[PDB]
Symmetry: C2
Subunit: 278 residues, 2 copies
């Protein structure tokens, strides 16, 4: 009757986060009586919000800024990649138990898998943020051979490289970013994890685009515009490209799979984000 | 933007409760980016659900069975009729403070005011359970003269009668129910507050229909079916009737006024419940 399945999000601020619209578009397309509740939860409210979703019998929730690290204190179980990353953005509630997952690198991995396998690949990640850390871990756990993290502050890249070497079978390497980064020979996958190009069709991270082969898979975490200058330049060179909007859609699909055992429709989720972004 | 104003309900079980559909239709019509979240909350989970609503920055919530008395333990303040009734079904969240209200009789009083004034009236309430106490208190606070509570368990009617006499200006009287009885000739308002007729045509509370007058307003709290056998029988004898659907609508309006200080459209909400049933 009138009891919808409850999911949602804890973050602050939350007003500009379109995940609610994306995920509910998926729910509606599937004919699933489920809701996503986008909550503005302050740091001092996180513990009570987590206990609140349990008491209200939600089946899952996301955590965004500034809760991804702090939430680990309130969980019963932490999945492998979340353990290594040290952050959780997707919590499942299973018979009162709170199970933390990290999917910030999994949207990218799902996009990647549509074109090639990560196993044995040599990868370059531009930038050393939260996105870069999760992407590096997921690639390493998925069998990548070599991961180079490129950052102006090389010590931040070195933190991720050290994580990869210490906790995975993959080799991690850090490189300081100075001028147009030239991809080392044999690079299979290039990923932008910077915000250069976010909301700016004319901005691109400083990469020597001529260092790409036509075989190099080029990906960008930026979801808006989904066709960034970086990706447009790569595609013009003949490269297979993966956009950040698709990755966000994949992350929502994976999360709802974790929560409810349903695979939502990617097309309607994507179109919802395209409409929101204009 | 993507943050909706959050409201909702804590109760168990909750799947049969249509308030979500009714309130959200009101929100939609009024252009309000607000949501009503219908949660199944067990007694063991009430304290954490309340703390949850505060942490998630809801602006209010309803409580239904089995939480109406238990929620008192979580309130920072309580409104006049709720304090008297000793139960709360509507809680406003203001600056992290929880203020408890009772609307279980206010829906009825709003419906009543469409046909008559409660002031100076002589009222018979069938049943001492459910909203009978809330209805008795609201009538008394609105100036009713005399309120008879009829119940099989006479002691339960006596408690309500004593509350009216001790804490209000109205007169309370308890009556032991032993089948069909004749209404006093001056009875202005007759209210079914039992569940007799709930999801069941041909079931009606036992009272002597022939003791009704043209002037008696006959009301039923049952929302489904809205036209109970009781009300159909009263209509057949020419009485003005008030159904439980309109009362639930009025409860929803009053609750949202408490939460948001906006009056939702009672026609769109009634229509929503009409479609559902």
């Amino acid at each position: 009757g009138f009891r919808s399945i409850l999911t949602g999000s804890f973050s602050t601020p939350c007003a500009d986060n379109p995940t609610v619209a994306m995920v509910e578009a998926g729910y509606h397309h599937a004919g699933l009586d489920a809701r996503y509740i986008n909550c503005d939860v302050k740091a001092s409210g996180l513990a009570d919000a987590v206990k609140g979703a349990k008491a209200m019998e939600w089946v899952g929730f996301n955590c965004s800024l500034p809760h991804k690290v702090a939430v680990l204190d309130h969980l019963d179980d932490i999945a492998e990649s979340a353990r290594l990353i040290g952050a959780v953005n997707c919590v499942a509630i299973r018979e009162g138990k709170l199970i933390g997952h990290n999917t910030d690198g999994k949207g990218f991995l799902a996009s990647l898998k549509t074109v090639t396998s990560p196993a044995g690949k040599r990868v370059v990640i531009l930038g050393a943020g939260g996105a870069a850390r999760a992407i590096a871990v997921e690639l390493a756990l998925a069998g990548a051979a070599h991961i180079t993290i490129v950052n102006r502050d090389a010590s931040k890249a070195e933190t991720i490289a050290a994580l990869i070497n210490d906790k995975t079978e993959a080799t991690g390497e850090a490189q300081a970013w100075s001028g147009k980064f030239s991809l080392p020979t044999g690079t299979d996958i290039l990923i932008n994890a910077t915000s250069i190009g976010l909301g700016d069709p004319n901005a691109a991270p400083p990469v020597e685009m001529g260092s790409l082969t036509k075989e190099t898979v080029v990906a960008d975490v930026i979801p808006n515009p989904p066709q960034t200058r970086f990706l447009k330049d790569a595609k013009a060179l003949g490269c297979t490209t993966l956009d950040g909007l698709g990755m966000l859609v994949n992350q929502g699909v994976i999360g709802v799979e974790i929560w409810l055992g349903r695979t939502l429709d990617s097309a309607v989720m994507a179109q919802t984000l395209e409409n929101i972004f204009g």
